[PDB]
Design a protein around this ligand. Structure first.
Ligand SMILES: [Mg+2]
Ligand SMILES: [Mg+2]
Ligand SMILES: [Mg+2]
Ligand SMILES: [Mg+2]
Ligand SMILES: [Mg+2]
Ligand SMILES: [Mg+2]
Ligand SMILES: [Mg+2]
Ligand SMILES: [Mg+2]
Ligand SMILES: [Mg+2]
Ligand SMILES: [Mg+2]
Ligand SMILES: [Mg+2]
Ligand SMILES: [Mg+2]
Ligand SMILES: [Mg+2]
Ligand SMILES: [Mg+2]
Ligand SMILES: [Mg+2]
Ligand SMILES: [Mg+2]
Ligand SMILES: [Mg+2]
Ligand SMILES: [Mg+2]
Ligand SMILES: [Mg+2]
Ligand SMILES: [Mg+2]
Ligand SMILES: [Mg+2]
Ligand SMILES: [Mg+2]
Ligand SMILES: [Mg+2]
Ligand SMILES: [Mg+2]
Ligand SMILES: [Mg+2]
Ligand SMILES: [Mg+2]
Ligand SMILES: [Mg+2]
Ligand SMILES: [Mg+2]
Ligand SMILES: [Mg+2]
Ligand SMILES: [Mg+2]
Ligand SMILES: [Mg+2]
Ligand SMILES: [Mg+2]
Ligand SMILES: [Mg+2]
Ligand SMILES: [Mg+2]
Ligand SMILES: [Mg+2]
Ligand SMILES: [Mg+2]
Ligand SMILES: [Mg+2]
Ligand SMILES: [Mg+2]
Ligand SMILES: [Mg+2]
Ligand SMILES: [Mg+2]
Ligand SMILES: [Mg+2]
Ligand SMILES: [Mg+2]
Ligand SMILES: [Mg+2]
Ligand SMILES: [Mg+2]
Ligand SMILES: [Mg+2]
Ligand SMILES: [Mg+2]
Ligand SMILES: [Mg+2]
Ligand SMILES: [Mg+2]
Ligand SMILES: [Mg+2]
Ligand SMILES: [Mg+2]
Ligand SMILES: [Mg+2]
Ligand SMILES: [Mg+2]
Ligand SMILES: [Mg+2]
Ligand SMILES: [Mg+2]
Ligand SMILES: [Mg+2]
Ligand SMILES: [Mg+2]
Ligand SMILES: [Mg+2]
Ligand SMILES: [Mg+2]
Ligand SMILES: [Mg+2]
Ligand SMILES: [Mg+2]
Ligand SMILES: [Mg+2]
Ligand SMILES: [Mg+2]
Ligand SMILES: [Mg+2]
Lengths: 190, 88, 145
RNA sequence: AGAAGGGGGCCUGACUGCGAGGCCUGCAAGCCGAGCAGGGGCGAAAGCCGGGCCUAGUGAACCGGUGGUCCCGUGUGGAAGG
RNA sequence: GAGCCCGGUGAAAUACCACCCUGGCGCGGCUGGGGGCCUAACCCUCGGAUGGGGGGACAGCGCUUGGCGGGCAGUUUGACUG
RNA sequence: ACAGCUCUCUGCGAACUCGUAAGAGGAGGUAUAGGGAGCGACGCUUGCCCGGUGCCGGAAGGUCAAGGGGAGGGGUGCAAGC
RNA sequence: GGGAACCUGGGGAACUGAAACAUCUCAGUACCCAGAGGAGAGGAAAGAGAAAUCGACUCCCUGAGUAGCGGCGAGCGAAAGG
RNA sequence: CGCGGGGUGGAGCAGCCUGGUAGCUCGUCGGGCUCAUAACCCGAAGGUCGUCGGUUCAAAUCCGGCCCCCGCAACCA
């Protein structure tokens, strides 16, 4: 309505269920649905999202403080990847196709925050404070969101999942949306 | 063929193309002849007392307007050219 | 095809109304059997005022009831009803009620549209009303000698 | 055959720009082609390579079709169309 | 996404709100095709009818679509050549 | 040409013909009738082939003109739009 | 009703030409019919066309055999402006 | 050039668009039927599901790209 009504997400418990559902065209020729990997997202979030950096057993004093809370090392190569209830989740960059204990034994893998300057500094931002959403087939849409408390200052669901419309080829015209969930879902234009 | 509030008619031709496209390749018309678009007729009775009309077709209503009169008219049998000559 | 109607017809019968139809129905049935007429702004405007020149033409049988209400209401009647106690003698026909209003205050009386069902024929107090629609109930009193 | 033939190695000059000068010739067509410039192939090199030992293996313009480029673009702009 | 569940395990976990592929039903729109009855346009009729019979949105007629169409028309049916 | 035979068309505003039409023949007729076709009194007869052609019959499918239909695309304007 | 041609409207050929011929040409000519009259039509902008322009209409001379039209054949052929 | 339909045991047909497990038919051959035969009855092996590879955990198959096949197509200087 009018703009993109944020506080439209109002009972349940701790309202933290806003969404960004919107369709478009399937696979117009080549491409499809590839939102920005861990986009900035104009939200301080507060999401103490326990992110893991499977870097090394030498980065366990600041890799933990690398924006999340708990981060192990390479002892998760054959000690933690053998079961069905035992086997975020990072990996190794550069070119190392290190997909042995994390590719079959799948939860999150592509590349780790290219920050060899430090695993946790005061100049590096976005490693445990960003989101994404690849494809979804004959049922796309859906993005991340914060809590209920946020005036016309929670305009992050109208810039990361609504501007992430740069991975759309040609063959149709995107349309129909709604920002909400666990409550309902009202729609907003562009 | 007549007209009433309308008019006689035209006798335009009938071109005949075994053409192509110009929006494809070339194109041409084999021939044409003198047609006869017989100005769409039709007749309407109606009443001022009980009159007859070979109304145009387009102007069909038109009559019905002329209908809506009442100018003190009696035994004429005709009584139409009496609406017409005072018609638009 | 806009047209005014007449003899209320089903689907479209709110007399003197406006309804669209296929030229045929009008031009052949409705129109011929004087049950409606062409949208003719003429018969349209003329009709229009055949309403306002009636709406307030009858809205006088209601307007001159408010001038008669703010008067026949309070001001009672007080009839010299020649009676005396028990079962009165000469019942109160409006030929007397109106006769003791018209032929008393020089005011319009309607010895019928008065709400009188029967002559009473006994002394007491009443408050019948002036008919029909909005009504002015004259409070009428009875007396003796 | 003192190769145009038989075999091997790299290559794509079966190029773009042009063309002095001829052959043949009624016109229009057809025919060989030195050499300059451009960037290339093979070679140590002098050099050769603008298709095929050689003559047949094809069809004026008109009309449309696809590509592109600078030009035109009906008051001007851009388009529709040349 | 956790009060209105995980679990264990598998390609994927459910209590709930959603955006939508698959697909049918539920009251409306806009349009369609059909099969019925009608009469009043159009048609035909009846000892002369302001009417009565029967046909009836059909037929007939205007425009436009495609086809059949020597019934008729204009034409074409090469040149060399003892 | 002929009587006579046969196939065939035609339900009456008949089919068919003349005519742009109105109208008229048909016929003031109504299938024991009217038109078209071939054969040609009368006697005995008239075989086989429905692949191709024509015509009669097939409320299924194939193809198909408008028109309806609008997924999708292009032109322009800052735009609502056109 | 008449009237030598002359004018306007309504209709409206073919031979020819293209060295055949069907678009095309001849040609809106011939001729037919109506009508107007000493003439007829046309006539005061819902124009023209690129000029800060022009200013009813009709006739002549140029524009110009240009622009264009065209089985881009034969051939046809303006207008503004002066 | 436009559209859009089919490769499946030897042959000629379903199946997949809802993936998930390849089945009709006829024949090949061996028994059962008489002396034998066609009518017949039964048991059988026989496909990298056209491929270059895109998806899915997994394709005969879901959607494209490709060699014929196959019908509608509209001209043709
Ligand atoms: Mg979709
Ligand atoms: Mg286990
Ligand atoms: Mg042709
Ligand atoms: Mg032509
Ligand atoms: Mg001609
Ligand atoms: Mg109309
Ligand atoms: Mg009049
Ligand atoms: Mg007028
Ligand atoms: Mg070589
Ligand atoms: Mg030469
Ligand atoms: Mg050279
Ligand atoms: Mg060569
Ligand atoms: Mg030519
Ligand atoms: Mg041509
Ligand atoms: Mg322009
Ligand atoms: Mg539980
Ligand atoms: Mg749906
Ligand atoms: Mg509906
Ligand atoms: Mg009837
Ligand atoms: Mg009737
Ligand atoms: Mg009809
Ligand atoms: Mg002939
Ligand atoms: Mg010839
Ligand atoms: Mg000879
Ligand atoms: Mg017959
Ligand atoms: Mg007769
Ligand atoms: Mg004979
Ligand atoms: Mg015999
Ligand atoms: Mg046969
Ligand atoms: Mg047959
Ligand atoms: Mg049939
Ligand atoms: Mg269509
Ligand atoms: Mg727009
Ligand atoms: Mg005269
Ligand atoms: Mg000719
Ligand atoms: Mg010629
Ligand atoms: Mg010719
Ligand atoms: Mg010709
Ligand atoms: Mg003079
Ligand atoms: Mg004059
Ligand atoms: Mg004026
Ligand atoms: Mg002069
Ligand atoms: Mg001049
Ligand atoms: Mg000159
Ligand atoms: Mg001039
Ligand atoms: Mg297939
Ligand atoms: Mg098949
Ligand atoms: Mg095959
Ligand atoms: Mg097969
Ligand atoms: Mg599907
Ligand atoms: Mg079987
Ligand atoms: Mg078998
Ligand atoms: Mg056998
Ligand atoms: Mg067998
Ligand atoms: Mg064998
Ligand atoms: Mg035997
Ligand atoms: Mg097998
Ligand atoms: Mg394989
Ligand atoms: Mg195998
Ligand atoms: Mg298969
Ligand atoms: Mg296979
Ligand atoms: Mg598909
Ligand atoms: Mg072809």
């Amino acid at each position: 309505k009018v703009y993109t009504i944020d506080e439209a997400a109002r009972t349940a418990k701790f309202d933290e269920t806003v969404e960004v559902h919107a369709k478009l065209g399937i696979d117009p020729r080549r491409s499809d649905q590839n939102v920005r990997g861990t986009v900035s997202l104009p939200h301080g979030l507060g999401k103490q999202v326990r992110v893991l950096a499977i870097a090394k057993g030498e980065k366990i004093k600041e890799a933990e403080e690398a924006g999340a809370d708990y981060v192990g090392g390479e002892e998760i190569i054959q000690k933690i990847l053998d079961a069905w209830m035992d086997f975020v989740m990072g990996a190794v960059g550069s070119k190392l196709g290190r997909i042995l204990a994390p590719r079959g034994l799948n939860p999150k893998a592509g590349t780790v925050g290219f920050n060899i300057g430090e695993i946790i500094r005061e100049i590096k931002a976005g490693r445990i404070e960003f989101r994404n959403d690849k494809t979804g087939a004959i049922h796309a849409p859906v993005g991340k969101a914060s809590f209920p408390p946020e005036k016309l200052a929670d305009n992050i669901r109208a810039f990361i999942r609504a501007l992430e419309a740069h991975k759309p080829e040609g063959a149709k015209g995107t349309f129909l949306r709604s920002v909400y969930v666990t409550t309902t879902m009202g729609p907003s234009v562009r | 063929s007549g007209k009433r509030p309308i008019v006689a008619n035209s006798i335009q031709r009938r071109g005949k193309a075994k053409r192509e496209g110009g929006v494809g390749k070339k194109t041409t018309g084999i021939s044409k002849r003198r047609q006869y678009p017989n100005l769409q007729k039709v007749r309407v009775r109606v009443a001022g007392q009980e009159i007859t009309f070979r109304v145009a077709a387009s102007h069909i209503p038109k009559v019905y307007e002329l209908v809506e009169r009442a100018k003190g008219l009696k035994l004429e049998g005709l009584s139409p050219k009496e609406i017409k000559k005072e018609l638009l | 095809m806009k047209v005014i109607l007449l003899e209320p017809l089903e689907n479209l019968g709110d007399v003197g109304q406006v309804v669209d139809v296929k030229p045929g129905y009008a031009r052949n049935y409705l129109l011929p059997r004087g049950l409606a007429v062409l949208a003719t702004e003429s018969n349209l405007k003329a009709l229009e005022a055949r309403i306002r020149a009636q709406a307030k033409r009858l809205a006088e049988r209601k307007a001159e009831a408010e001038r008669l209400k703010e008067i026949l209401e309070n001001l009672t009647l007080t009839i010299p009803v020649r009676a005396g106690e028990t079962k009165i003698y000469g019942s109160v026909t409006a030929k007397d009620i109106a006769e003791a209003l018209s032929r008393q205050h020089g005011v319009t009386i309607d010895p019928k549209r008065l709400a009188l069902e029967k002559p009473i024929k006994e002394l007491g107090e009443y408050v019948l009303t002036y008919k029909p629609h909005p009504e002015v109930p004259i409070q009428l009193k009875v007396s003796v000698v």
